[PDB]
Amino acid sequence: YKEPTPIQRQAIPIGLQNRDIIGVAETGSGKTAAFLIPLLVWITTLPKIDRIEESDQGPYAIILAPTRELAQQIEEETIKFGKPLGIRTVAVIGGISREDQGF
RNA sequence: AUACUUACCUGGCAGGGGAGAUACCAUGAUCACGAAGGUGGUUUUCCCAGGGCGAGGCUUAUCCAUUGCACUCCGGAUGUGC
């Protein structure tokens, strides 16, 4: 990602203040990274003592999409950002086996 | 209702008798006439599995016939289960 897209330029700093956002822009405009980046900053800067939890307590974040097709787009991009950072992403969507999903 | 599209939930794999035997047919088998066999038929014997046909018999009631002398069951009809 060589340069921030417009939505990224403005939404990222608002997200870094923990503020809610309504972003008006269409898919293809770099929305996904705009919301992913403040989340990754937050997660990876928690103290290790605080990133510690022994029981599984579900996700730090949920990203809801209207369609399976859009959800998968988001997933692919989330993986490519999250893996290098040791951040795990799971897709709960239709068109996939419930065994695989359940697992 | 039907067809497709997207999203969500779901998601094991594999099959269709078996085992013998076949002298005969095909496979016209690459070494001086030939393989054996295997494979595919055919026929047949086992292990047998599900159907078809229902002769005969068992059981019980309505109607009909019967007043009959036997000691070899045993008139007709119709219907539920066997």
- Taking alpha carbons only, the member of A40, A21, A44, A53 closest to residue A81 is A40
- Is residue A94's beta carbon less than 7 angstroms from any atom in nucleic acid strand B? yes
- The beta strand positions in A14-64, using DSSP E, are none
- Is residue A64's beta carbon less than 7 angstroms from any atom in nucleic acid strand B? no
- Is residue A76's beta carbon less than 7 angstroms from any atom in nucleic acid strand B? no
Give this entry's resolution in angstroms. Answer: 3.3
**How large is the C-alpha radius of gyration of chain A?**
15
Please tell me what DSSP assigns to residue A97. Answer: -
Tally of CA atoms within 13 A in the half-sphere of A60 that contains its CB: 17
Nucleotide nearest to A102 (CA to C1'): B10
Q: Which amino acid is at A13?
A: P
What distances in angstroms separate CA A44 from CA A5, A29, A53, A87, one per listed residue?
23, 25, 15, 9
φ/ψ of residue A96, rounded to 5: -125, 145
